[PDB]
């Protein structure tokens, strides 16, 4: 038939599905070790080949409660965290 590898040409949907899933799983498995940081990157890559992040996010939120996902969301923005860590010096009270 033919060979098999990651990101062959992308014209084929089946190859993209195979790799996309290989990454979805590989990530969960690395996190099963504890490499959350790699899960964020690998998941970001899964989105890079899917192009429909939001669909996948709904699919990830319903298949299992994802704590890593929350860290993916914290890895993305940097400036935002700085505002919070100043505006109200991280956290403040109310009366």
């Amino acid at each position: 038939r033919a060979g098999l590898s990651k990101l062959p040409d992308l014209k084929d949907a089946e190859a993209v599905q195979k790799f996309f899933l290989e990454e979805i799983q590989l990530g969960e498995e690395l996190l099963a070790q504890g490499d959350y940081e790699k899960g964020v990157d690998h998941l970001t890559n899964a989105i890079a080949v899917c192009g429909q992040p939001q669909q996948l996010l709904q699919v990830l939120q319903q298949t299992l409660p994802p704590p890593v996902f929350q860290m993916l969301l914290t890895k993305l923005p940097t400036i935002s965290q700085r505002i919070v860590s100043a505006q109200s010096l991280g956290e403040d009270d109310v009366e």
Binding site: Q17, L21, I24, Q25, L60, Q62
Partner: peptide, 11 residues
Amino acid sequence: GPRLSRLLSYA
């Protein structure tokens, strides 16, 4: 288990 391919059976 370390196999997120549960939902992915849908496609």
